[PDB]
Subunit: 333 residues, 2 copies
Amino acid sequence: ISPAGLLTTPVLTGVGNDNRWNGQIVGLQPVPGGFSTCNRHWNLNGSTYGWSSPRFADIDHRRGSASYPGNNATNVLQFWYANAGSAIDNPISQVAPDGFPDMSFVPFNGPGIPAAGWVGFGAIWNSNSGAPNVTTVQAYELGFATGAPGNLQPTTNTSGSQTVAKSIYAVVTGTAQNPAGLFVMASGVISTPSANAITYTPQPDRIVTTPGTPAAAPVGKNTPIMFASVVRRTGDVNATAGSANGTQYGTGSQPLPVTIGLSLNNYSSALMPGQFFVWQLTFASGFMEIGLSVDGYFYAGTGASTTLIDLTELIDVRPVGPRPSKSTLVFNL
Amino acid sequence: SKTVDSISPAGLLTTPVLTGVGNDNRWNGQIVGLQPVPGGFSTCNRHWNLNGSTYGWSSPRFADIDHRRGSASYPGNNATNVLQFWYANAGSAIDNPISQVAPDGFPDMSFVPFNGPGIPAAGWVGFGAIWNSNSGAPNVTTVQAYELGFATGAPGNLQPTTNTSGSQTVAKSIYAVVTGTAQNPAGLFVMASGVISTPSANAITYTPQPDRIVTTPGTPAAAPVGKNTPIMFASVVRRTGDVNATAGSANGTQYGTGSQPLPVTIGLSLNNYSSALMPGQFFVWQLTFASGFMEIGLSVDGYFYAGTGASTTLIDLTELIDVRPVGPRPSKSTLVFNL
């Protein structure tokens, strides 16, 4: 089966959403330093090194530890954590619950809001009954850390880590239960300290991976890219593309339609070592080539550039075929 | 039937759409069943026909629900730990390019009114907050799970309605917020993938039932044709009474239904299939199971049908192995049901 069908015009012209934020892909973000990603990311040999299925549903862990500071539970910041490896009900991997975001935790004390955190809506729930603790509904920052619960530090390696959650605003009444469940919707927003947008999120040094995860490195002038979508932010929930407060981008390593396709069929014989599968992206006034490596990462021939490539004027996606990764991908925009 | 000079509808429905990959167009849940509706039903929101058109107010996607200019309120003189209320009039969603009837993603279900503390049965519930109309900043003391739906009579006694005309898009937190707000104007922001409210841990019947679905005037209805009966697509949807329950739970399995698989909705929105099918025909696919097979048909109005007659029993797709296109067939011919 040829990889050609993985990338069609609708995937990049409005229909395809990225595999981290589930947002509508509108840009290609070059990463000249390279990056890694495993969560909800598949390769051409039918494998993922992450812990999530290719879908956005919810994040569910039955046996964490919930806590809050002080002697009064009223209007506190709710905390929750579990150890990496303790998501033993997850058939993909037991590292973390299916859908838990692959981002290092941004610690915060309050009342200020953390910058560049993955934030989702949810609650603590009763491990024995499944009933949500209705006084704990809030927006929570989720991420990977060490040192929980008292001395939190970010980490980008799942080995020895903890999956932590902390409400960014006060809950009605906090809970201190162990065990305690966490339930959070899997489609997130980006936390910001003010109404202003921040840089694209996550930056490469924030992405959490499992041991064995291959990194994407540049090949000549061919540079790994992420797929950019306009993602809501906590500082200004009404802002979209072109906001006077700035446009907020969230990035993913793959379009989810590609991830799904890679999870359904094996493409191991499609490419020889050193090759990309190439598609041509044709715009109103030019074109570019995009390449897919056997590790599942996409590339553009943009060299050292960090400028976002706008897909607003993209007209068509057409397959080219396997090409040597040593050849510069055409960039005629 | 004749070979058509157009994109064939065959590619809209492939094996992964019904064996785990396809999600339904109301709850965004993984489709695992086909739910026959012998009495028929209507649906327009996030529903497309074979003429590239929708009568609803939502794009074929699940992102968020956003309205800048509603009215927020709560009962009594003290805002602490109240149930937060919000509403706007239908027709006021002037930021929605598809339609101004309601915000993109607002659920097409009639509001189930409630006073508290009991939780209403069969409400669409999403997570969100009230936000400041001038600045866009969320009101952080109003984050909660909210029931959303259509009603009339706000701010007075709410009455359910299934007609968008003259209606109000309303939201009410099912649990207490930290501090309510009474501002007008006030924004609403709610994530578009919902859960089903239940009063206890027990599952309820599939949601929404046909008499709960809100449509705009002119929306075509799905009516039975001979022994062929309209179907909804069923997914297992989380419920507020037991957020950990999934398929096979001892507390019961909760189904949410949609009129179409979202991959079909998307495909129908990208190309016009008016020359692919004539009125009076179904586009038919064969669904092959481990032991048996059945046909399902797609009408020009975008509704799916099965040859199940008066049966109300959900059809389990666990053992579905293959979907193969059959082609245009007379809608009067009974669709094969050999399971």
